[PDB]
Structure formats: C-alpha cells, structure tokens
Amino acid sequence: EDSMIMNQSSIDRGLFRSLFFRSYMDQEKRFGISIVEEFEKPTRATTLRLKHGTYEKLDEDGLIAPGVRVSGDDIIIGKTTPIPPDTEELGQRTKYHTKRDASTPLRSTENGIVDQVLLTTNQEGLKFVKVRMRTTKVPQIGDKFAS
C-alpha cells in the first residue's frame, strides 16, 4: 500500500540525510516619544508575566549566542516593554514591576543548535535581530519519498 522498506545501514552512512534551518525575527517597536522596547534579559523581579521557558541561555544583551543547543519553549530573544508603575513604590525596595515581558520563545516542537545571530537596525533606526537555528533530520518511519 505504497510503503517502502529502507536499509538502516544506508541511513546510518548518510543516505537522504538533510539539514534544516529556521530563522526568527524581532525588532524594537516605538510607541511614543519615549516609550520604546528594549532587548534585555528580563528578571523575575522587575518584569511580570514571564514565559514559562528558561531565560538562562540569554546573553547580557538579551540575545542567545551561536553554538548553543536550544530546546522547545526556550527563550532565544529577550525583549521587554515598559509599563506605567503601580503603587508598589509604597514599600517595595526597588523590586516593583515596571516592564512587561515580550520575549520570543523557540517553537514547542522544534529544537536544534543556534547557528547564526544577526543584529542590525531597521529603516526606522531601531534595533532589529534575526536568529537562525540549525538541526539535522535523519530519515525514519513515516518520511515521504518519491521517484
């Protein structure tokens, strides 16, 4: 019924093995005269409503570095947007939420190696990043082939 049998040893030797790249884009938006988004590693204290993933793979500038293995739901771009502070200045020792998280997580079903990170400026002069992820896909039961 249109199935086929493949040699496992040929697959081990590199038959029909391929390479997969996926790129992610993000940029800093401008909402007003001094309301800008920032690429940064958000902290559990100064930001609220964080993603359930892990932020420990981000660098100081909020961007992951190439060569780092990533898994699903990991944060590859760290971005925060400002929020008007609440009355928490009552008795909080500077530990009050002023920013909201807008980070970009890796897709839940995908994982791989960070291949190349690009940082530049858009037409408007704001920061603009692109992250490319690389993985290898080996043939297995269910993959589609054709003559």
């Binding site: 040699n7 030797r13 590199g14």
Partner: protein
Amino acid sequence: MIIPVRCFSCGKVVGDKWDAYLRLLEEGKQEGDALDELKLKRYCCRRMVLTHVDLIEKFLRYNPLEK
C-alpha cells in the same frame, strides 16, 4: 557537497579516491576505465563516485565570515 566517506549500499570506503579519480580523468582515461583502475567493482560503489557533484568548491568561493 563533498565525497561521502562510505558507499551507502555496502559500506566500502570511497572517500579517499576522489583525488585519484580526478587525476585519472585528467590524463584522458574514460570514466569506466578510471573507476576500474580504482578497484570499484560493484556498481553500488561506482554510482557513488560517478554521480557525485562537488558543491564545496562553490561554497568556498564566498569570503569567510571571520578572520
């Protein structure tokens, strides 16, 4: 992209015969005679060298990203 180390079907090592194959073809030998001179009997091995396309010579023409 670059000559495979092992033949997919059986597993003979063909990765060390690319340079010799090119040298033989340079001297005017036919492809069949060149493959015979390298002791590639089974056609499963012969297709590996015969149908290989060398793309790394095109990737190397781009300026390296670091220095």
